[PDB]
């Protein structure tokens, strides 16, 4: 903290020194500016500078919009890929469920579970939503209890 104290002492003084340097430079520039404004030159140079600054600002805003658009576009391509991935999951899963339906029918035939077919078709007549399997599980549980 003593070192920091020394650093801050030197730094604040040096900033003040630069302030005095800048004040001197500003004063000399202002004084010479008075004597220099007597031709239409300085005004022309100033406007030209403002136009250049405005072009710079437009460039910066263009880059900002470019940055935001590229960020948005990368996420958009990622989301397109994710939707395709979800479609892949649906394809993989539905195929599996089809095989499982064949397997489940096999288990029902061995165990003589007549409800298996009825429940499967009922599921296919309502696989548009959150199908409730509670009754199906209850039926297989009762069947298993009977067995």
């Amino acid at each position: 903290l003593t070192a920091q104290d020394e650093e801050l002492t030197q730094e604040i003084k040096q900033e003040e020194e630069q302030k005095q340097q800048f004040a001197q430079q500003q004063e000399i520039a202002l004084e010479e500016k008075k004597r220099l404004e007597r031709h239409e030159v300085w005004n022309l140079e100033e406007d030209k500078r403002k136009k250049i600054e405005n072009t710079k600002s437009l460039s910066s805003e263009i880059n900002s919009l470019q940055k935001k658009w590229d960020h948005k576009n990368s996420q958009y391509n990622r989301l397109w890929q994710e939707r395709e991935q979800s479609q892949n999951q649906i394809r993989q899963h539905e195929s599996g469920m089809e095989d499982l339906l064949g397997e489940l029918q096999f288990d029902a035939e061995e165990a003589a579970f007549s409800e298996h077919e009825v429940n499967v078709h009922d599921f296919e007549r309502h696989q548009e939503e959150e199908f409730d399997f509670s009754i199906w599980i209850g039926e297989i549980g009762s069947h298993e209890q009977l067995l």
Binding site: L1, T2, Q4, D5, L8, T9, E11, I12, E15, E16, Q18, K19, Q21, F22, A23, Q24, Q25, Q26, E27, I28, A29, L30, E32, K33, L36, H39, E40, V41, W42, L44, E45, E46, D47, K48, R49, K51, I52, N54, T55, L58, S59, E61, I62, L65, Q66, K68, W69, K72, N73, Y76
Partner: protein, 196 residues
């Protein structure tokens, strides 16, 4: 959203070209009032005025910032110095405490360095706890009066005088350290009469 943003960006790009085209017109008027010597000195003066104004404005904001930073540094340095002085004194006090017990010769000491002494007895922290050991010392004192009564054993708590500098109100934050030493400073001694 992408289409709207891209359209806005293209509008900005068109505007940038339009602003670029307009700079040339200023130059044309500049050329025909072409005095090069007046222009170069005017440009130098404009740059100097811009630099000076920027510097003085930035410095007017920063200098107070570093002054306040220096204020904070001084406050925290005073606090740190207080703590450093306090712990030098406290370490010296613990040195005095430890030197008192070692002097008895009840316990032998390899080297009078606190880290070394702690290393010599580190084991005991694993063995006892203050309450337990105090209890068992009382238990032993009770037990040992069955055999030795003719010797007139006796214990008496032994205490070390409070260092006077403990009196200086180091403040709230330090009171806990004084209380701990003050609490712990009390220790028990035993002396037994044997053949006179």
């Amino acid at each position: 959203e992408l289409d709207d943003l891209k359209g806005d960006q293209n509008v900005k790009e068109s505007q940038l070209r339009k602003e670029k085209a307009e700079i040339e017109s200023i130059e044309q008027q500049l050329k025909l009032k072409g005095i090069e010597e007046v222009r170069l000195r005017i440009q130098q003066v404009q740059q100097e005025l811009r630099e000076a104004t920027e510097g003085i404005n930035h410095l007017l904001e920063t200098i107070p910032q570093k002054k306040a930073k220096q204020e904070t540094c001084q406050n925290e340095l005073a606090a740190a110095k207080t703590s450093a002085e306090f712990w030098s004194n406290m370490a010296d006090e613990w040195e005095q405490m430890v030197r008192a017990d070692i002097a008895r010769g009840f316990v032998e000491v390899v080297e009078m360095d606190p880290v070394k002494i702690v290393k010599q007895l580190e084991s005991i922290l694993g063995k006892y706890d203050r309450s337990k050991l105090n209890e068992q010392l009382t238990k032993t004192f009770i037990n040992e009066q069955i055999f030795l009564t003719e010797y007139r054993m006796f214990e008496y708590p032994e205490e070390t005088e409070r260092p006077e500098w403990f009196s200086k109100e180091w403040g709230e934050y330090y009171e806990p350290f004084m209380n701990e030493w003050n609490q712990l400073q009390s220790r028990r001694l035993i002396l037994m009469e044997y053949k006179g």
